[PDB]
Amino acid sequence: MGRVIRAQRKGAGSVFKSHTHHRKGPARFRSLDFGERNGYLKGVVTDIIHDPGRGAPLAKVTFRHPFRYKHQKELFVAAEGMYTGQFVYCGRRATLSIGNVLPIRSVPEGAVVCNVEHHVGDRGVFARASGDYAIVISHNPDNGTSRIKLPSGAKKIVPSSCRAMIGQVAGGGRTEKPMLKAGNAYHKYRVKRNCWPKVRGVAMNPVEHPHGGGNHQHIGHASTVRRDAPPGQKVGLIAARRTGRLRGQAAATAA
RNA sequence: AAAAGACUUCA
RNA sequence: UCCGUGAUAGUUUAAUGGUCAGAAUGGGCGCUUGUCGCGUGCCAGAUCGGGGUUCAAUUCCCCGUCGCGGAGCCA
RNA sequence: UUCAUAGUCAGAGGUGAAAUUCUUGGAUUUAUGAAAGACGAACAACUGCGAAAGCAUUUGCCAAGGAUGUUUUCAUUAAUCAA
RNA sequence: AGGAGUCUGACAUGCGUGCGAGUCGACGGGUUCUGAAACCUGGGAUGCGCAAGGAAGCUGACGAGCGGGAGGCCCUCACGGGCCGCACCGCUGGCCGACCCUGAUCUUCUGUGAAGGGUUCGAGUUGGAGCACGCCUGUCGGGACCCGAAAGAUGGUGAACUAUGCCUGAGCGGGGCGAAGCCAGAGGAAACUCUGGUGGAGGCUCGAAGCGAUACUGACGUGCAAAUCGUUCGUCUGACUUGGGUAUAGGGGCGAAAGACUAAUCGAACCAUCUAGUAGCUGGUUCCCUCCGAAGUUUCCCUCAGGAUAGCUGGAGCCCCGA
RNA sequence: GGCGCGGCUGCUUCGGUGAGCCGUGCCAUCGGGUGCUCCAAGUGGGCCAUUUUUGGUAAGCAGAACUGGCGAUGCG
RNA sequence: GCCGAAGAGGAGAAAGGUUCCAUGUGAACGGCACUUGCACAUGGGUAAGCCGAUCCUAAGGGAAGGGGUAACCCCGGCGCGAUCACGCGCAUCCCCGAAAGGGAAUCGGGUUAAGAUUCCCGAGCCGGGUGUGGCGGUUGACGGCGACGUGAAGUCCGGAGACGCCGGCGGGGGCCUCGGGAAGAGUUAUCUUUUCUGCUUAACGGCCUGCCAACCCUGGAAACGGUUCAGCCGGAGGUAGGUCCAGUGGCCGGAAGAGCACACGUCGCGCGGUGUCCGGUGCGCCCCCGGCGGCCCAUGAAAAUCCGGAGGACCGAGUACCGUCACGCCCGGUCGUACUCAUAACCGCAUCAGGUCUCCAAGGUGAACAGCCUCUGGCCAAUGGAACAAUGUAGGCAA
RNA sequence: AACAAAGCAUUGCGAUGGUCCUCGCGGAUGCUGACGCAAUGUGAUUUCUGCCCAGUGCUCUGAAUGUCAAAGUGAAGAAAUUCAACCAAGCGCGGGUAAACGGCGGGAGUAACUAUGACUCUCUUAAGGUAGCCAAAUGCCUCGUCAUCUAAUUAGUGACGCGCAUGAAUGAAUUAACGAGAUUCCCACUGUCCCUGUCUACUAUCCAGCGAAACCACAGCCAAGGGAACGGGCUUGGCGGAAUCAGCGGGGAAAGAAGACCCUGUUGAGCUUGACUCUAGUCCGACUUUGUGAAAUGACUUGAGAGGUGUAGGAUAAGUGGGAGCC
RNA sequence: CCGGUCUUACCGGGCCGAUCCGCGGAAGACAUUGUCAGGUGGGGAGUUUGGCUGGGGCGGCCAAUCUGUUAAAAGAUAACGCAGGUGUCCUAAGAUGAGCUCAACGAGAACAGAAAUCUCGUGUGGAACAAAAGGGUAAAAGCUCGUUUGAUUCUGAUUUCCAGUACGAAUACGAACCGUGAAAGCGUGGCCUAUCGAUCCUUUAGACUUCGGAGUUUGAAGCUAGAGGUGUCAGAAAAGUUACCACAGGGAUUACUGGCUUGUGGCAGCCAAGCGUUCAUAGCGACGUUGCUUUUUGAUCCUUCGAUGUCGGCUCUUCCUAUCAUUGCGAAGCAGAAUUCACCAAGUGUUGGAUUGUUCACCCACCAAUAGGGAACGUGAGCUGGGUUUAGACCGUCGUGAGACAGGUUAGUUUUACCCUACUGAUGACAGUGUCGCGAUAGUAAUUCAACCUAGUACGAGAGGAACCGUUGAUUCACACAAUUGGU
């Protein structure tokens, strides 16, 4: 049989983890007391600070409104075009301006949003990463459902009460340009949850992977491996729909 | 609104 | 050199239950067409070499020539 | 087109002819409703405008340019031009 | 000097001794010496026997010689035969259950049971037995004559070595080359261009501290050293080097993945235990003498480096033909 | 071993025969090289020579047969 | 003669664990001698308010439900006022975790065989904790256009500490250096003299000509002007100029006719001299420090502590209220400190050519490497003797 | 030359993510969000990346038909035991899918000089090797053949060439820079060489002192022969004055290691897989947790009705007691 | 609004002052656990993975069974010994009885050749009997015809199995029961010589037995007998790799050195077809045949697996002769003359380079010629370390894969202080002394070339082109010295 394949090493352990202490703080969207046509939540962006845990920026927002419990703060997710000294509005009668957060119901159809909730008050799930955005296609006055298209193209049915932020996430185009030092890849790995560099399965000797062994390097068996297959076996193309470059489309996806 | 291709050189 | 794996018409290549052998292409003959070709009807194998068993062997054994794959450590 | 809902049967799609495709797990075709994306039919004409490329939903905003008419200014100031 | 047939059980025996169709004694009490033990005794325990068969019902006799050949007698005695007579072996056949067949008398619910035969198996006579301990010898066993491997398993102890991570510090002489783009000078309508020039980017170059470890296939090779020395060679602002504090622990970890690395131990760490593993394999197994004196063949066998069963041997008893 | 007497029996005609059995009498060049029982051993891998072989060019080959020796046998 | 970033200088971390100092020995050690020693024996030495521990918090060791797991084992009111005694307010807890992250305060001279920034002598300061008076002030401060300089419960907001890499200007430091040239030392087969040491003093109470950066100060009013090493800056008002703030291990000057030797000259004391010398060069951008530009698919710790903004209920009469000066005092209650730190004190079985961390990158010529040096300083490794063949190992040169 | 790498592709993932550790809590995912995370293939640039879905892998839809477990459910039935009906995922039935595993052959005849073959055939098993490269770090034959270079070159380089057995992300070709990587040539130079010398140093040697191990059944001459066929010693021959110093290591099958090779042993161990058997994990159906009801559509009591398909018989003799009369 | 107070006042307490009333979301009889069922399931774990055998593989059956030969044996008898069969096929391809007798050849029949068919004559085992071999048999055991069912049940003495060991098989009976047949008899499977499967379980057969108060149904348990898998045939449920390896052993067994052999290899003799114009023997020489060597290859398995260090090379000593050169020779198809073949002969020589790890061999210029063969393929307590031959890696080929190849490639370690012995070299007693000597005996030193004299002679048509001494010098080796030249 074998010594454990790296995929089990994910598992638990100090080596597989991110530097979670290092991450900058929780960036959850403030669950509104109530009302909010301008300023029972008014923010000023004061600063824009990088998030190591995702590599795109946050905007530092204060947020100052009262009560007790009152709760306010802090570093909310940046959208494109957010600047120091711009106003942020968070809630139901917030102005429809980029950087403001409000429930989907309040948003006009055809407006790009980010930090969209799965479930109301979870504060925001979908459209997060750099330069991505969901697109709110349908509402109507929809008591029942607000239809949003996520960046993959899947059309998601969400409760109209789910809040989102208008605009697309900052940092777009990050993906376009090539890393162009091994060392650039290296530090970028250090920050995230990953064991790098990666040795190819074929490169190893048999004990380390299903791919390993053989004088010349090659996968002894067919690469694409079972949904049924157990952990340790399941490597390569897991249960692949198709392979090789030709004749597909993006995901389509029914409701 | 057309199934269907060729066809040696110099005179 | 050892263990595995085949061969059937000019060529590529199906097939059986022991009594029965095919296809496609290529080719041989007509018709298309002014003439070739595209197309259209017609035709034609000692099942590798070899011996044995049987009522009857293309089919069941054994050998061999060739073409294949796969092994051949610790020097 | 997709989604949902209504109803419903043996086709549909497509062409030269067909097949691929789609198809009983109820399609397509049919009605209404939603969201998204694209484009502006009808209008659009031997037609108008920008220096040219080009530019066509109506509608609102900033701001340009060519007509004219004035006889105001420079009173012939100007023209074309490789780089 | 130490260093190998031990220990006792079972099952089978040899040799011996007491009673002998039963024998056989714990445990208690009774009692001395002695922690002992002994003796009397109830007599546990109910073996092996005393007769057997078989799934189970349930059933269940002991008479005979024949031959060889022990020995007595009769005789008659130089010889000698006749008879019985039993050892013991060979040979014969009936019986008692089981199987199968015929079954009387008859009982008359029901079936028992004379006579007789076949058949194999076991049993019974002239082939009548044991028990008990001791002392032997074997077999199997328990570590099983003794030593001798790699192992597998459980639970602990290791990241002071080393791998990777994290935290937080520290280190990199000096020199070379010259990316951003802007000045002047100069051109063009613009676009932007030429030449001088500045500034300095870099898993950049030559190289110090520091890291690494290519070559002599040198020196050493019971060393300075359980991987060292000299000289050579590579890197040296980076995916770099490194101090400390520190994660991740055994088919698990860690690996830029070599089966590399986890305290001199890694294709599965170390410790202790299971454990006196287990070895058809190698080695060894310690006093004298006597009588006789090998096999290296045959069938079976996951069988051919062994078992098994005869074959080859030898002892111990019993008896009196054979080329 | 052979004979006679007497009983019983068999297989194969209500048919012919011996054989078997029992009972009873009669008459007849070697020389212990040897039987039976219990329990135990190494084995349960050989060799060679001679003779006869079969394979193999052969072989200090391989593999049998028949025997004597070595193994386990001194001494000359 | 050798050692030179330490093939052998100084200070230390870990680790050792008394190895240190002294005296006395010499059986064993030291791979040999030994009078010696890091061997043996006996005595002796380490002294902290101001060094460090200590307090904080960082990967994480986690204490704290519930629950798997028998189980081992593993994941995830308190506080404060308040004096008369009593009531009021809130959100994520609490310890360990760096003797090299962060941090309240000390130097100079002297002295011991052995300690020493540790005791002393002089001087200073801190922290923590009760009294005192000078007065600076009083319906909670004047001055300076301004900037800015010279009370107090309930209650919110917060810096410093506190932070990456590259390049790299500026201040100035101790250096290196030169000369005027003291004071005093070398030395001349044969001189000019030069050459050499040497001229040195705190921490810090007080003064500063106080750089850069910010001055959206004021004031001025540039459409081309100012200005850098470079980028730049400006009419959301440039350059002048009237102002500010504002560093330092940094100028001054005091601490300080406090101070031990440096050297010579002296029995001892003393006395003189040096310590109250002058001036400057060399991007040595070195270490400390303040700025700038550039850079990252990569963004560079936290808390303790120090410390103030507010925004204020209450309280301000010959009564009564605060806060730097000064000052007076007490406390200062814990542990550690020796020595080695390595070709002999660590790890490696050894007095092992191995391995093992920080600072001293400013010692002189030459910065191409390497060498040589010197007032630091340190050393001649536990074997010698006499020849010198071949063999061998290091190694030069060969027509 | 291995690994990494930046760059290039497939695939899984809609969040309580899929995936890893874990009985579990929970954690790691991720205090992230498809421009993200995992799982894998290949490996800068540049030009490119052909054909095959038959087998294997995997995936898709399956409201319909042959196979497809258990339970509940029906039949015989005292049980139970035998049988049925229902049927998931899974075989079947069908498709997609090679930058998935991988594959890319076979033999023929033929031109108006011969030569050669543009031209006509199919089969295994899906296809039948395109661009390139090619005497290859892949070529057996083999030092292939030609050329360069050298005197002379199994080397090296260039060209050819049915390639024993090249070839496209099992990546093909190509290629600047880089390199303690592999091979070759030239100049410079030289003691590597002709061919050895002298010289230094420390050893050596000798002296004083200190003072070891390995190893040791064995006395220890040569040439022959013999012998278990590789004798220091038997046998015959031949030689030898001992002892001691220094050396060259010929021999003692010299010491040093119970051969790593190889064979066996009903030995071990790591690894593999479509041997065997199992065990986690995943998918899927059922049972508890568990409470409701629309009806559509299955079923049971009573009660009141339409009627009851064996030969002949108008039609109603399905089959039982009753049975001479009920209004 | 109330209370307290000093009611031109001050304090406390309650209510109202943007509200009455009555944790959030999602989702819900699912899901998630708990449990069970089917499917996938080297992710993990435990395991196995057939012998023989001229080494194990790899091919093969010679792990069961028959035979002619082997086989010397009455019986028993080996080899991967020769030769070849059986693992089926048969209710007629059995049984019996009556009745017939061949295969085949000649002769005869228009057509028919394959021509049967039909006839006659001769016809002894040559035919016929399913099937190997072999042996057997002529009113049959073979043929023909009818009938029949005994290929029935149960039992077995005994032989084979095997000298005593099982299943199997045979060779007979008896008991029961039939047939045919005239019957006597024959008939206990196949002409004969004999043609296969335990053990649990299951299956059924027949009858009977049995399962713990009585009583009654259901099944179970069982005796005796037959059929269902074991061809690894006297009976396992069952694949590989390891070059990462490990262990116990074996020279019981390989590679490998040695030894035996000597087919192979090398060399020779004999004979002499034949060719060389003619001429066997100047030369060349087949077929055939006998040998010698031990230095290639093969064979064997004696020696070592508690260890024999590998190839190639280098250097260093020694040898053989089957002689390449040199000396002396003989013949010639030897006019000179280059030569060609061969005799005696081992003294001395036998080289330097290019490719390749190479040995070998190819090539180049040399040379007088650049011989071959042994000494453990002489030579690792000398060296070297390129190949071979570990662990890393690539390519090609094969394999599902681990991984493999007498397929290629890059990288990849060389321990020891000499006790004995051997020799080189130095010491060194006894004896009446030192020195000078003798010389038994022991080691070997000179080899070869070029050129000149002879001679442009001999010999020769010519072309070309010799000898002996006499002279000079140099290659190679040895000893030695150092004036010179050269090094230091």
Side-chain angles (χ1 to χ4, degrees), chain A residues 130 171-180:
Chain A
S130 302
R174 210 189 70 189
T175 300
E176 295 189 12
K177 100 93 156 63
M179 310 287 167
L180 296 152

Side-chain angles (χ1 to χ4, degrees), chain A residues 201-207 209-220:
Chain A
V202 180
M204 313 156 171
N205 41 77
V207 55
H209 207 121
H211 280 91
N215 182 63
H216 70 281
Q217 296 183 24
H218 60 108
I219 184 168

Side-chain angles (χ1 to χ4, degrees), chain A residues 101-158:
Chain A
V101 61
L102 44 180
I104 200 166
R105 186 167 180 267
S106 65
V107 70
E109 294 175 345
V112 171
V113 293
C114 60
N115 309 271
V116 184
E117 329 186 283
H118 198 298
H119 282 284
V120 189
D122 75 37
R123 303 134 307 206
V125 191
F126 318 130
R128 295 191 56 173
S130 302
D132 281 88
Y133 54 84
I135 197 163
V136 178
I137 189 167
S138 296
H139 285 110
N140 298 356
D142 199 345
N143 283 117
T145 297
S146 59
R147 174 165 162 255
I148 299 166
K149 188 161 63 180
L150 316 189
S152 66
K155 290 168 286 171
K156 200 159 174 176
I157 295 168
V158 72

